Enzyme design. Structure first.
Site, PDB file in Angstrom:
ATOM      1  N   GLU A  32       0.784  -1.135   0.001  1.00 21.93           N
ATOM      2  CA  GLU A  32       0.082  -0.063   0.004  1.00 21.93           C
ATOM      3  C   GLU A  32       0.765   1.358  -0.008  1.00 21.93           C
ATOM      4  N   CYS A  40     -12.208   4.183   0.284  1.00 31.74           N
ATOM      5  CA  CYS A  40     -13.646   4.400   1.098  1.00 31.74           C
ATOM      6  C   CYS A  40     -13.180   4.559   2.672  1.00 31.74           C
ATOM      7  N   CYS A  45     -16.530   6.303   1.566  1.00 28.56           N
ATOM      8  CA  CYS A  45     -17.394   6.084   2.378  1.00 28.56           C
ATOM      9  C   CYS A  45     -17.531   6.369   3.692  1.00 28.56           C
ATOM     10  N   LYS A  48     -17.371  10.634   4.363  1.00 31.56           N
ATOM     11  CA  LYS A  48     -18.731  11.101   3.406  1.00 31.56           C
ATOM     12  C   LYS A  48     -19.828  10.972   4.704  1.00 31.56           C
ATOM     13  N   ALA A 113       4.531  -0.007  -5.478  1.00 32.56           N
ATOM     14  CA  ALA A 113       5.166  -1.144  -6.362  1.00 32.56           C
ATOM     15  C   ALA A 113       4.910  -0.909  -7.846  1.00 32.56           C
ATOM     16  N   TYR A 175     -23.540   9.921  -8.192  1.00 32.53           N
ATOM     17  CA  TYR A 175     -23.812  10.057  -6.973  1.00 32.53           C
ATOM     18  C   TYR A 175     -22.807  10.824  -6.146  1.00 32.53           C
ATOM     19  N   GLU A 179     -24.193  13.499  -3.493  1.00 33.62           N
ATOM     20  CA  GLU A 179     -24.005  13.464  -1.889  1.00 33.62           C
ATOM     21  C   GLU A 179     -23.307  14.772  -1.537  1.00 33.62           C
ATOM     22  N   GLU A 307     -18.227   0.928  -9.101  1.00 32.50           N
ATOM     23  CA  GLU A 307     -17.685   1.225  -8.202  1.00 32.50           C
ATOM     24  C   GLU A 307     -17.981   1.515  -6.931  1.00 32.50           C
ATOM     25  N   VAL A 340     -27.066   2.399  -2.301  1.00 32.39           N
ATOM     26  CA  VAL A 340     -27.920   3.524  -1.561  1.00 32.39           C
ATOM     27  C   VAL A 340     -27.191   4.766  -1.888  1.00 32.39           C
ATOM     28  N   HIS A 437     -45.365  -1.155  11.918  1.00 32.96           N
ATOM     29  CA  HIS A 437     -45.860   0.051  12.219  1.00 32.96           C
ATOM     30  C   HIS A 437     -45.597   0.848  13.192  1.00 32.96           C
ATOM     31  N   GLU A 442     -42.806  -0.479   6.034  1.00 34.93           N
ATOM     32  CA  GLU A 442     -44.033  -1.281   5.567  1.00 34.93           C
ATOM     33  C   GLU A 442     -44.674  -0.988   4.363  1.00 34.93           C
TER      34      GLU A 442
HETATM   35  C1  FAD Z   1     -16.106  10.569  -2.226  1.00 42.78           C
HETATM   36  C2  FAD Z   1     -16.462   8.888  -2.405  1.00 42.78           C
HETATM   37  C3  FAD Z   1     -17.617   8.490  -1.674  1.00 42.78           C
HETATM   38  C4  FAD Z   1     -17.607   6.931  -1.686  1.00 42.78           C
HETATM   39  N1  FAD Z   1     -18.593   6.212  -0.893  1.00 42.78           N
HETATM   40  C5  FAD Z   1     -19.044   5.076  -0.996  1.00 42.78           C
HETATM   41  C6  FAD Z   1     -19.933   4.618  -0.188  1.00 42.78           C
HETATM   42  O1  FAD Z   1     -20.610   5.120   0.702  1.00 42.78           O
HETATM   43  N2  FAD Z   1     -20.150   3.133  -0.484  1.00 42.78           N
HETATM   44  C7  FAD Z   1     -19.636   2.491  -1.412  1.00 42.78           C
HETATM   45  O2  FAD Z   1     -19.680   1.400  -1.504  1.00 42.78           O
HETATM   46  N3  FAD Z   1     -18.538   2.841  -1.931  1.00 42.78           N
HETATM   47  C8  FAD Z   1     -18.312   4.287  -1.810  1.00 42.78           C
HETATM   48  N4  FAD Z   1     -17.358   4.790  -2.591  1.00 42.78           N
HETATM   49  C9  FAD Z   1     -16.468   3.938  -3.553  1.00 42.78           C
HETATM   50  C10 FAD Z   1     -15.362   2.942  -2.663  1.00 42.78           C
HETATM   51  O3  FAD Z   1     -14.618   3.830  -2.232  1.00 42.78           O
HETATM   52  C11 FAD Z   1     -14.590   2.481  -3.796  1.00 42.78           C
HETATM   53  O4  FAD Z   1     -15.571   1.512  -4.939  1.00 42.78           O
HETATM   54  C12 FAD Z   1     -13.663   1.249  -3.351  1.00 42.78           C
HETATM   55  O5  FAD Z   1     -12.758   2.093  -2.328  1.00 42.78           O
HETATM   56  C13 FAD Z   1     -12.931   0.678  -4.250  1.00 42.78           C
HETATM   57  O6  FAD Z   1     -11.870  -0.496  -3.855  1.00 42.78           O
HETATM   58  P1  FAD Z   1     -10.449  -0.682  -4.514  1.00 42.78           P
HETATM   59  O7  FAD Z   1      -9.973  -1.907  -3.666  1.00 42.78           O
HETATM   60  O8  FAD Z   1     -10.698  -1.196  -5.811  1.00 42.78           O
HETATM   61  O9  FAD Z   1      -9.608   0.452  -4.317  1.00 42.78           O
HETATM   62  P2  FAD Z   1      -9.328   1.573  -3.433  1.00 42.78           P
HETATM   63  O10 FAD Z   1      -9.962   1.697  -2.142  1.00 42.78           O
HETATM   64  O11 FAD Z   1      -9.090   3.086  -4.190  1.00 42.78           O
HETATM   65  O12 FAD Z   1      -7.733   1.324  -2.719  1.00 42.78           O
HETATM   66  C14 FAD Z   1      -6.775   0.983  -3.700  1.00 42.78           C
HETATM   67  C15 FAD Z   1      -5.424   1.417  -3.110  1.00 42.78           C
HETATM   68  O13 FAD Z   1      -4.198   1.038  -3.772  1.00 42.78           O
HETATM   69  C16 FAD Z   1      -3.074   1.876  -3.315  1.00 42.78           C
HETATM   70  N5  FAD Z   1      -2.233   1.948  -4.504  1.00 42.78           N
HETATM   71  C17 FAD Z   1      -2.413   2.410  -5.733  1.00 42.78           C
HETATM   72  N6  FAD Z   1      -1.308   1.945  -6.715  1.00 42.78           N
HETATM   73  C18 FAD Z   1      -0.575   1.472  -6.024  1.00 42.78           C
HETATM   74  C19 FAD Z   1       0.849   0.883  -6.249  1.00 42.78           C
HETATM   75  N7  FAD Z   1       1.037   0.871  -7.320  1.00 42.78           N
HETATM   76  N8  FAD Z   1       1.397   0.556  -5.059  1.00 42.78           N
HETATM   77  C20 FAD Z   1       0.931   0.446  -3.977  1.00 42.78           C
HETATM   78  N9  FAD Z   1      -0.287   0.803  -3.556  1.00 42.78           N
HETATM   79  C21 FAD Z   1      -0.919   1.558  -4.568  1.00 42.78           C
HETATM   80  C22 FAD Z   1      -3.864   3.135  -3.188  1.00 42.78           C
HETATM   81  O14 FAD Z   1      -3.088   4.147  -2.486  1.00 42.78           O
HETATM   82  C23 FAD Z   1      -5.207   2.842  -2.401  1.00 42.78           C
HETATM   83  O15 FAD Z   1      -5.247   2.720  -0.960  1.00 42.78           O
HETATM   84  C24 FAD Z   1     -16.869   6.209  -2.601  1.00 42.78           C
HETATM   85  C25 FAD Z   1     -15.976   6.596  -3.570  1.00 42.78           C
HETATM   86  C26 FAD Z   1     -15.702   8.128  -3.149  1.00 42.78           C
HETATM   87  C27 FAD Z   1     -14.473   8.577  -3.941  1.00 42.78           C
HETATM   88  C1  FAD Z   2     -48.934   3.382  23.861  1.00 39.89           C
HETATM   89  C2  FAD Z   2     -49.091   2.695  22.796  1.00 39.89           C
HETATM   90  C3  FAD Z   2     -48.251   2.511  21.757  1.00 39.89           C
HETATM   91  C4  FAD Z   2     -48.486   1.509  20.812  1.00 39.89           C
HETATM   92  N1  FAD Z   2     -47.649   1.560  19.730  1.00 39.89           N
HETATM   93  C5  FAD Z   2     -47.792   0.687  18.594  1.00 39.89           C
HETATM   94  C6  FAD Z   2     -46.740   0.891  17.469  1.00 39.89           C
HETATM   95  O1  FAD Z   2     -45.724   1.695  17.291  1.00 39.89           O
HETATM   96  N2  FAD Z   2     -46.917  -0.072  16.363  1.00 39.89           N
HETATM   97  C7  FAD Z   2     -48.083  -1.138  16.735  1.00 39.89           C
HETATM   98  O2  FAD Z   2     -48.072  -1.969  15.797  1.00 39.89           O
HETATM   99  N3  FAD Z   2     -48.794  -1.222  17.907  1.00 39.89           N
HETATM  100  C8  FAD Z   2     -48.935  -0.245  18.580  1.00 39.89           C
HETATM  101  N4  FAD Z   2     -49.753  -0.161  19.641  1.00 39.89           N
HETATM  102  C9  FAD Z   2     -50.796  -1.314  19.758  1.00 39.89           C
HETATM  103  C10 FAD Z   2     -51.817  -0.860  18.814  1.00 39.89           C
HETATM  104  O3  FAD Z   2     -52.438   0.605  19.327  1.00 39.89           O
HETATM  105  C11 FAD Z   2     -53.257  -1.731  19.127  1.00 39.89           C
HETATM  106  O4  FAD Z   2     -52.586  -3.161  18.934  1.00 39.89           O
HETATM  107  C12 FAD Z   2     -54.214  -1.589  17.988  1.00 39.89           C
HETATM  108  O5  FAD Z   2     -54.783  -0.248  18.116  1.00 39.89           O
HETATM  109  C13 FAD Z   2     -55.362  -2.658  18.382  1.00 39.89           C
HETATM  110  O6  FAD Z   2     -56.324  -2.460  17.108  1.00 39.89           O
HETATM  111  P1  FAD Z   2     -57.741  -2.800  17.582  1.00 39.89           P
HETATM  112  O7  FAD Z   2     -58.634  -2.706  16.509  1.00 39.89           O
HETATM  113  O8  FAD Z   2     -58.083  -4.233  18.235  1.00 39.89           O
HETATM  114  O9  FAD Z   2     -58.309  -1.817  18.657  1.00 39.89           O
HETATM  115  P2  FAD Z   2     -58.212  -0.329  18.895  1.00 39.89           P
HETATM  116  O10 FAD Z   2     -57.254   0.628  18.193  1.00 39.89           O
HETATM  117  O11 FAD Z   2     -57.937  -0.062  20.346  1.00 39.89           O
HETATM  118  O12 FAD Z   2     -59.713   0.264  18.700  1.00 39.89           O
HETATM  119  C14 FAD Z   2     -60.802  -0.339  19.411  1.00 39.89           C
HETATM  120  C15 FAD Z   2     -61.686   0.876  19.236  1.00 39.89           C
HETATM  121  O13 FAD Z   2     -62.980   0.228  19.844  1.00 39.89           O
HETATM  122  C16 FAD Z   2     -63.759   1.229  20.263  1.00 39.89           C
HETATM  123  N5  FAD Z   2     -64.837   1.045  21.076  1.00 39.89           N
HETATM  124  C17 FAD Z   2     -64.897   0.134  22.308  1.00 39.89           C
HETATM  125  N6  FAD Z   2     -65.802  -0.251  22.715  1.00 39.89           N
HETATM  126  C18 FAD Z   2     -66.905   0.048  21.758  1.00 39.89           C
HETATM  127  C19 FAD Z   2     -68.497  -0.006  21.716  1.00 39.89           C
HETATM  128  N7  FAD Z   2     -68.955  -0.953  22.617  1.00 39.89           N
HETATM  129  N8  FAD Z   2     -68.961   0.853  20.866  1.00 39.89           N
HETATM  130  C20 FAD Z   2     -68.233   1.666  20.101  1.00 39.89           C
HETATM  131  N9  FAD Z   2     -66.975   1.711  19.897  1.00 39.89           N
HETATM  132  C21 FAD Z   2     -66.223   1.025  20.892  1.00 39.89           C
HETATM  133  C22 FAD Z   2     -62.778   2.070  21.017  1.00 39.89           C
HETATM  134  O14 FAD Z   2     -63.116   3.401  21.234  1.00 39.89           O
HETATM  135  C23 FAD Z   2     -61.581   1.980  20.148  1.00 39.89           C
HETATM  136  O15 FAD Z   2     -61.507   3.228  19.128  1.00 39.89           O
HETATM  137  C24 FAD Z   2     -49.703   0.702  20.782  1.00 39.89           C
HETATM  138  C25 FAD Z   2     -50.585   0.809  21.701  1.00 39.89           C
HETATM  139  C26 FAD Z   2     -50.246   1.691  22.734  1.00 39.89           C
HETATM  140  C27 FAD Z   2     -51.429   1.698  23.995  1.00 39.89           C
END
Ligand code: FAD
Ligand code: FAD
Lengths: 448, 449
Positions: A32, A40, A45, A48, A113, A175, A179, A307, A340, A437, A442
């Site tokens: 190297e 990267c 990577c 960035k 090299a 990209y 970015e 790349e 991504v 949810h 989802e």
């Molecule tokens: C700004 C930017 C952001 C990027 N973001 C992402 C990302 O988020 N996700 C992603 O998947 N990819 C990303 N990439 C791409 C990723 O960096 C490259 O695809 C990956 O590094 C390539 O791997 P490589 O082994 O081919 O080469 P490199 O990682 O470039 O490495 C080759 C190495 O060879 C060495 N070298 C060269 N010639 C010689 C020599 N003759 N003797 C000795 N050493 C030598 C160099 O110094 C170097 O370290 C990004 C690239 C850039 C520029």
């Molecule tokens: C704080 C909290 C956070 C939660 N967070 C999540 C989450 O992020 N993700 C997730 O997947 N789940 C979550 N849940 C669980 C989710 O809210 C419940 O599983 C879901 O609402 C259940 O649906 P249900 O149809 O059985 O009843 P409910 O949504 O409770 O609805 C039943 C309805 O029946 C009505 N009712 C009751 N009796 C009568 C009646 N006799 N006449 C008329 N109307 C009536 C009520 O007023 C109510 O509106 C959470 C629950 C709580 C309490």
């Protein structure tokens, strides 16, 4: 010295391949020239995403916090604190990589090299040889050939900025440009994004580039379409003026070129080894990452494949599996690779865009499901942001071939859906799973 | 008497979902709701809870994480009335959206409390209505302990009615509602105490989860008090409350929230008259198809004792209307492998078997567990690093995945897609052959070793 396996480059492909080979009892070296972790970890990577989370915090403070009841003053944004925190984190990652290579008994050689011949490398005066050589040299930023190009910086220079500039222009449409413009806009600079055509991310599903323009028009960066740079002029007061071929100009304090990258396959004397590169300078490799020379392989950005780090890592590990663990047909399938983009809002995409699916299967075969809703985080504020999701299905079975979304939550939701896509999920598979949810994710299992 | 094809008592998650789907196949329906449409989830549950979780995330970003990112900020005022006004306006918009769909579906919505007159007849507001199919989807309500001073405590309905954020708060309970509420209140800045009866909250969750959650509470609040059995609440002279525990510990707070449990609301609707049987805990007993013992009467949601989640009430309600009115004689909900997210600090996501359950059911020799533990990247550059821990539970040679568990930033959005994969019968090889997305927390499940 002689080794079983040498990887030139300690970036994503080189480290992943050499660690996997060392597990099978191979004696390995990794060369190297600069910092372990490559693009990267150091200028890619990792820094960035830290800068993205910093923008996200500034937006929670400044943009969304008031409607949630928080009247806040940002007294100071200390840029040096954020860079010192980012640097310490990357330093800790370097130590971890070193520890892993050490345990694996890999010799790490710090130097640049070059090939002497097909089996020989010179590094720091020394000559080393091996029966298997991996070239994983990555790439580097491209710069346009226009007057004044040298007053602009590139993504590497962005990570080395001493302060956040007041007015910033980002040029490019892929990209990285999106970015960086999204992060710089999020941290408060007056930000302009210049794309050559009508929208950024033109190869992405239309829903995605359409929505991103929408968001940009509402919250920045200021998008300028049909923008071809012609020249940059340095002004007396030190600002810069970017001139576009059509006559438009913008004066900024900092200009970032983010037009593309090119392969770093040039000063390593490939000629000696006889490795053939293509027109664009990429090392030509087959399905198995074999170069034209028996015993020399290439993975990563220098091969012209997509790349991304996970791709260089997965190709590099499968290569060591084929060579050293007798899996003669082991190789990376490069289709259905999830991406991504850490734009504002994030983008996640895997599979075919709706245009691709229609071209490939015909309009008759393709069924598209779409959902558009306001991100719950933003729904209680005056800065509502769309979330748009699309599933592209083919056939009567509606087999899923593309999953695309832009909105809060896209960065963490996509991985599991990519596993389902890889298994051959149909819309029925999604619909038979119970929703969680409340979440953005989802929406993909309750589409109608 | 007016006669309907289908009547649902309860306009919450299961009632609305079932009536809308029935109305789609041409059934003339009535929906009776005694208070507000959307039931518990929309009005005092899922939706206001998540809006308050976001407000705690923004205050944590301002106050906890922001200074290490270089933002020096002063919160000049936290206006609680503003937050409650935005929250309430949002829920009113959702009421309108439900009214719009029900109206487009020609459902008659009756506002009042319904009671049975006989197996096919309901009385609501002095009027009598009858139907061939009646769905009881009455939900549940907060339970309260029988101890001196219980009436000085509020419950989760009362939490959503708070006029201001109290300075010191005790939340009593150990389930997901007490945990969520204590983390939100602590995140919003109040001195918060969580009181659990045994050694940890979420004792039914995989051990890795309750363990990591204790670690986080000990580092950043709320203050956790274990082996706590409430003995009495004393109202003090100054207005504060002192919660007294059986073992002699005591704590003085300004507000006390009971979040010990919820009971079915099946007791005041004259079920006796209809002949419907309930179990010992008061839930309506249903079979696999949501049938009660009385032909033509069905129940879904929280009042049946099934898992207390909105998507489950929704999915069982829709599949019941498909079975009854769209000729799918076998449609029913599979209650296994239901995914859950808890909006704790950090969030939790789980689906499938916990490691203990998998070992009991399959034997130790069959179970392979993979675990990963790392620091959440958002917090990794700050002085407030927070763990992220993940676990895959696998069985057999094939390493079929039977449980996926995680606690950490990102668990709330990453779990849905992995629950689809688990439902598809994923093995560890299937996760391993998917290319990672970097840098995410979710990529950890496809790169576990
Ligand atoms: C700004 C930017 C952001 C990027 N973001 C992402 C990302 O988020 N996700 C992603 O998947 N990819 C990303 N990439 C791409 C990723 O960096 C490259 O695809 C990956 O590094 C390539 O791997 P490589 O082994 O081919 O080469 P490199 O990682 O470039 O490495 C080759 C190495 O060879 C060495 N070298 C060269 N010639 C010689 C020599 N003759 N003797 C000795 N050493 C030598 C160099 O110094 C170097 O370290 C990004 C690239 C850039 C520029
Ligand atoms: C704080 C909290 C956070 C939660 N967070 C999540 C989450 O992020 N993700 C997730 O997947 N789940 C979550 N849940 C669980 C989710 O809210 C419940 O599983 C879901 O609402 C259940 O649906 P249900 O149809 O059985 O009843 P409910 O949504 O409770 O609805 C039943 C309805 O029946 C009505 N009712 C009751 N009796 C009568 C009646 N006799 N006449 C008329 N109307 C009536 C009520 O007023 C109510 O509106 C959470 C629950 C709580 C309490």
């Amino acid at each position: 010295k002689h080794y079983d396996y040498i990887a030139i480059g300690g970036g994503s492909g080189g480290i992943a391949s050499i660690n996997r080979a060392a597990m099978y009892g191979q004696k390995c070296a990794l060369i190297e020239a600069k910092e372990l972790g490559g693009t990267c970890v150091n200028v890619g990577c990792v820094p960035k995403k830290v800068m993205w989370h910093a923008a996200q915090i500034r937006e929670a403070i400044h943009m969304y916090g008031p409607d949630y009841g928080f009247d806040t003053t940002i007294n100071k944004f200390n840029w040096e604190t954020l860079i010192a925190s980012r640097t310490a984190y990357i330093d800790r990652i370097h130590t971890s990589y070193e520890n892993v290579l050490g345990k694996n008994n890999v010799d790490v050689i710090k130097g640049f090299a070059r090939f002497v011949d097909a089996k020989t490398l010179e590094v720091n005066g020394e000559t080393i040889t091996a029966d298997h050589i991996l070239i994983a040299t990555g790439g580097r930023p491209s710069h346009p050939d226009i007057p004044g190009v040298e007053y602009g910086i590139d993504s590497d220079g962005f990570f080395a900025l001493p302060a956040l500039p007041e007015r910033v222009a980002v040029v490019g449409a892929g990209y990285i440009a999106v970015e960086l413009a999204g992060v710089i806009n999020g941290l408060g600079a007056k930000t302009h994004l210049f794309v050559r055509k009508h929208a950024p991310l033109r190869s992405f599903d239309p829903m995605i580039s359409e929505t991103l323009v929408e968001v940009m028009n509402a919250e920045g960066p200021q998008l300028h379409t049909n923008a071809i740079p012609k020249a940059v002029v340095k002004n007396t007061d030190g600002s810069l003026t970017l001139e576009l071929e059509d006559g438009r100009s913008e004066t900024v304090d900092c200009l970032i070129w983010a037009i593309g990258r090119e392969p770093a396959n040039d000063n390593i004397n490939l000629e000696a080894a006889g490795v053939k590169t293509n027109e664009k300078g990429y090392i030509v490799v087959d399905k198995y990452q074999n170069t034209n020379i028996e015993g020399i392989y290439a993975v990563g950005d220098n091969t012209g494949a997509v790349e991304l780090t996970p791709v260089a890592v997965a190709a590099g590990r499968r290569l060591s599996e084929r060579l050293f663990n007798n899996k003669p047909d082991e190789h990376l399938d490069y289709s259905n690779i999830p991406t991504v983009v850490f734009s504002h809002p994030p983008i996640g995409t895997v599979g075919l865009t709706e245009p691709q699916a229609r071209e490939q299967y015909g309009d008759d075969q393709v069924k598209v499901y779409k959902s558009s809703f306001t991100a719950m985080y933003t729904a209680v504020t005056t800065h509502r942001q769309p979330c748009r999701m699309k599933l592209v299905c083919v056939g009567s079975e509606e087999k899923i071939v593309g999953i695309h979304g832009i909105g809060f939550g896209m960065d963490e939701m996509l991985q599991g859906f990519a596993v389902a896509l890889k298994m051959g999920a149909t819309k029925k598979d999604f619909d038979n799973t119970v929703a969680i949810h409340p979440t953005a994710a989802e929406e993909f299992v309750t589409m109608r």
